[PDB]
């Protein structure tokens, strides 16, 4: 089983994957995010945030009102399962989480919470 995935967030406000499959055999799953763009995090910042499909809209909405200093995330938001930090050009960050935090038959969504980005920067994550 491949228990990790390398994802990129660029200046065109896009992730390089629209779907992630987490194999059931994995105990932990790792997401390695990088920013191959030229723009700084205050204008084109990207983070990889995971939540259930049902909680996405809430996380994104409250996230934007939180500000840059809060990584565009509502402090202690229980709806967030896992997340990388907000990164800009030339930066990278990884996040590892327990696969047991996920369940079969529930749709998950990964997305960037920087203002307006989730319009394009989002995708599905499923446990199979
Ligand atoms: Cu972004």
46 annotated to a ligand binding site: yes
- 49-52 and 28-34 as β-strands: parallel, antiparallel, unpaired? unpaired
**Strands annotated E in the chain:** 4-8, 19-22, 28-34, 49-52, 82-83, 92-98, 108-111, 122-127
Q: Contacts for 53-61 with beta carbons within 8 Å, 24 or more apart? A: 53/106, 53/107, 53/108, 53/109, 53/124, 55/79, 56/109, 56/111, 56/118, 56/122, 59/111, 59/113, 60/111, 60/113, 60/118
35 annotated to a ligand binding site: no
d(CA 9, CA 89): 9
117 annotated to a ligand binding site: yes
Output the CA 96–ligand 1 centroid distance in Å: 20
Q: Give residues whose Cβ lies within 5 Å of ion ligand 1.
A: 46, 112, 114, 117
Which residues fall within 8 angstroms of residue 61, CB to CB, at 6 or more apart? Answer: none
Contact present, 47 and 113 (Cβ < 8 Å): yes
* Domains of the chain, CATH where assigned: 1-128 (2.60.40.420)
Question: What does the DSSP assignment read for 107-128?
Answer: -EEEE--STTGGGTSEEEEEE-
User: What resolution in angstrom units was achieved for this structure?
Assistant: 1.5
Q: HSE of 124 in the Cβ direction (CA atoms, 13 Å)? A: 8
Q: Which residue has the tokens 């980005």?
A: 117
71 torsion bin: left (phi>0), alpha (psi -120 to 50), beta (else)? left
Strand partners, 118: none
CA angle (109 as vertex; 106, 62 as ends), nearest 5: 115
Method: X-ray
Question: How far, CA to CA in Å, does 117 sit from each of 4, 14, 71?
Answer: 23, 8, 13
Quickly count: other Cβ atoms within 10 Å of residue 125's Cβ.
23
Nearest alpha carbon to residue 24 among 118, 109, 87, 99: 99
């Amino acid at each position: 089983a491949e228990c990790s995935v390398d994802i990129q967030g660029n200046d065109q406000m896009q992730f390089n994957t629209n779907a992630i499959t987490v194999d059931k055999s994995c105990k932990q799953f790792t997401v390695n995010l990088s920013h191959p763009g030229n723009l700084p995090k205050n204008v084109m910042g990207h983070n990889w945030v995971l939540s259930t499909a049902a909680d996405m809209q809430g996380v994104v909405t409250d996230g934007m009102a939180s500000g840059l200093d809060k990584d565009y995330l509502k402090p202690d938001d229980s709806r967030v399962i896992a997340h990388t930090k907000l990164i800009g050009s030339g930066e990278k960050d990884s996040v590892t989480f327990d696969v047991s935090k996920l369940k079969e038959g529930e749709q998950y969504m990964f997305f960037c919470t920087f203002p307006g980005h989730s319009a394009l920067m989002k995708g599905t994550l499923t446990l199979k």
